[PDB]
Symmetry: C2
Subunit: 340 residues, 2 copies
C-alpha cells in the first residue's frame, strides 16, 4: 500500500539524504515509515557501524554529530536492504555503482523505481543503473553538497523524472523548507548537466589563472553553458529544451562549480604553476572528471564531424591532453559559433 524506500548508500551524502527522507517517510501517509539504508558494514572500535546506527541513530563515521530519524534502519546486506523497496535512492560513489548493481540485479521488487543522486558520468549513470536493474530511473541534481544539506542550509535541487505522478512522489519524499525541489520531465538533460559543467569549470579556472576578471569569466561560463545546451541537443534522447538549463542542475550548479570546486581550483593551478593535471590530482586529490569528460566529448564530436562547433570544450581537451598552451584558451573563444 504505502511505498517503501531504500537508500542505497550511507556516506556523507547518503546519510544527509536519510535525515530528509526518514522525516518525510514518517510524516506522509503515502510512504511506509520503515526506511532501509544499505550500509557497508565497518568495525568502529569493536562495534558494527550498522548496530551503532540502529541504537544511537548516528552514522558516527560519515556524518558524526547528526541524528538520523529513528525509523531509518541500517542494513548491511544490499539485497536485503533493497528487496522489498518500491523506491530506491542510489547515493554511492560513481566508482561502486556498477558492482552494487551487479549484486542487486534480479533481486528487486516488481514495479520498483529508482532515483540516482550520483553526479557525473559517454553513458549516463542513471542509464547504467536502469539497464542492469530493469527499473525506471529518475535523477536528482543541483547546486548542493552533502554537508550543507545535513546542516539544513538553504539550497535547491532539480529532479528529472519522466512520469508526473512518480515525480510528485519523489518531490514529496525529498523536499523540506531548506531543500527546495523543482521537478522537470527531461531526465537526460538534467543528468548531463552534472558532467558537462565540470568541463566549463576547468575553463573558468584557466581564465582565473590567466589573470582575467569577472566579466571575462562570465563570458567563459556563458559560452560554456551554450555549448552544454548544443551538446545536450545532439547527444540526448528525449526532448532537450534550453529552459531546463535555467534549473538548479544547469545555471546554478554551473555558477557554484565555476566559483568554487576542485575542477576550477586544479585548473587555476595548472594555468599558474605549470603542473600537469595528473601531478595536481596527486597533490590535491590523493582522477579529475572535467578533463576526462572533455576527452570523451572530443571523441563523440569527431564522430559527428562537429569538433569545430565546440571550441570551449575542445580547448579544454586540447590544453589538458594535447599540449595546447593554456595561454591560448581565450583566443579559442574569439570566433565562437554563438557570435557567427
Amino acid at each position: 500500500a504505502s511505498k517503501k524506500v531504500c537508500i542505497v548508500g550511507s556516506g556523507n551524502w547518503g546519510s544527509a539524504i536519510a535525515k530528509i527522507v526518514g522525516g518525510n517517510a514518517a510524516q506522509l501517509a503515502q510512504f511506509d515509515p520503515r526506511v532501509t539504508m544499505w550500509v557497508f558494514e565497518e568495525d568502529i572500535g569493536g562495534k558494527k557501524l550498522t548496530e551503532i546506527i540502529n541504537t544511537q541513530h548516528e552514522n558516527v563515521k560519515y556524518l558524526p554529530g547528526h541524528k538520523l530519524p529513528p525509523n531509518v534502519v541500517a542494513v548491511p546486506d544490499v539485497v536485503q536492504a533493497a528487496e522489498d523497496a518500491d523506491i530506491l535512492i542510489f547515493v554511492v560513489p560513481h566508482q561502486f555503482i556498477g558492482k552494487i548493481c551487479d549484486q542487486l540485479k534480479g533481486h528487486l521488487k516488481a514495479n520498483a523505481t529508482g532515483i540516482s543522486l550520483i553526479k557525473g558520468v559517454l553513458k549516463l549513470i542513471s542509464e547504467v543503473i536502469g539497464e542492469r536493474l530493469g527499473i525506471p530511473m529518475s535523477v536528482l541534481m543541483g547546486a548542493n553538497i552533502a554537508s550543507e544539506v545535513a546542516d539544513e542550509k538553504f539550497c535547491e535541487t532539480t529532479i528529472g523524472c519522466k512520469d508526473p505522478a512518480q515525480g510528485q512522489l519523489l518531490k514529496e519524499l525529498m523536499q523540506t523548507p531548506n531543500f527546495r525541489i523543482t521537478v522537470v520531465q527531461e531526465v537526460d538533460t538534467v543528468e548531463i548537466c552534472g558532467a558537462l559543467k565540470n568541463v566549463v569549470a576547468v575553463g573558468a579556472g584557466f581564465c582565473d589563472g590567466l589573470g582575467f576578471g569577472d566579466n571575462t569569466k562570465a563570458a567563459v561560463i556563458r559560452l560554456g553553458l551554450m555549448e552544454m545546451i548544443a551538446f545536450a541537443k545532439l547527444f540526448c534522447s528525449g526532448p532537450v529544451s534550453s529552459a531546463t538549463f535555467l534549473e538548479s542542475c544547469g545555471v546554478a550548479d554551473l555558477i557554484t562549480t565555476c566559483y568554487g570546486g576542485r575542477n576550477r581550483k586544479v585548473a587555476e593551478a595548472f594555468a599558474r604553476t605549470g603542473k600537469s593535471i595528473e601531478q595536481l590530482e596527486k597533490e590535491l586529490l590523493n582522477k579529475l572528471q572535467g578533463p576526462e569528460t572533455a576527452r570523451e566529448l572530443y571523441s563523440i564530436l569527431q564522430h559527428k564531424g562537429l569538433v569545430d562547433k565546440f571550441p570551449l570544450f575542445m580547448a579544454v581537451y586540447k590544453v589538458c591532453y594535447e599540449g595546447q598552451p593554456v595561454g591560448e584558451f581565450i583566443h579559442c573563444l574569439q570566433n565562437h559559433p554563438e557570435h557567427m
Copy 2:
C-alpha cells in the same frame, strides 16, 4: 552612401566605445571614417581631445583613434549622423534628447548603451523608449557583462545587441564587434534592456547572502531564483516579445553573475547585512550619497506588482524591497525564499 556615426557621450564608457567604433568605422568600407563624438566641454577639453587624442579626464592613458572628432555642441555632432550611439550618464539623457529633438537626419536610427531604467506611466520606463519617443527614431540597445575599463584595455568579453530590424542589427554588430568584444544580436529590445535594471535587485539579495555568511550554493539559488523572477516579471511587464532564451545571453545570466559577484549593489547590500547600517547611511559612507539603484528599482517593482495584485509571486524582489524600506530584518531574507512559486 557610407553610414555616418555620432557617439553621443564621452565619459569613461563613451571613450572606451569610441576606441572600438572609431577603429571599426575607419577600417570598414560601409562606414564613414569621420565619427563625431559629442563632448561636454570642460576648462581643464574638446580641444585637448582633438590635439592630443586622449580624454585626459575620463579615459587617461588611452589613445582614441584620430578619425574620432570631439564636438562641443550635440546638435552639430549629431545632425549629419545616420546612427546615433547614446552613451551618456542616465541623468543627462533627458537634456540631450531635448536639444536633439527635431534636428536629426531623416531616417536616422539610435542605439542606447545606457544601462538602467527610467520612470513612466507604467511605473518603470525603458531609457530607449524615453529616447525613441522624444526624438522619433527607431532604437536598439547594447547590454552585457562588460565594463568600460576592460573594453578599452581589450580584455575579452561579450555583449548583447537588441534590435528589431535584422539588417540594422547586422550593421550595428559590424560597427561594434572586435576579437575581444563579441556580439550576439537578438530581436528583443525590451527584454535585453530590462535585464540591466532588474539584475541590481537580485544583486542586493546576493549581497545579503554574502553578509549573512551563506555559501556559494545558497547564493547560487538566490541568483537563480532572482533570474526566474526577472524572466517572469519581464513576461508580464514588457512590450515586445519576451523569451526565456534571451536571459541566457550576456545581458541576462552573464551580467547577472558578474553583478552578483562584484559591483556596488552587492557590496552595499553585504555591508547593510553585516553592519545594520541603513542603505542611505552606506550610500553616504561609500558612494558620496549617490543613490544605489537596486533598492530604488525594487520600490518601483513593488508599486507595479501591488497594482496588479502580484506581490506574492515575486518573493525575492519583494524581500529586497521590504528589507530596504519596511524594516524587515535582513536575517529573514532567506526565509522569504522557502515557499517560492518556482517550487510550487
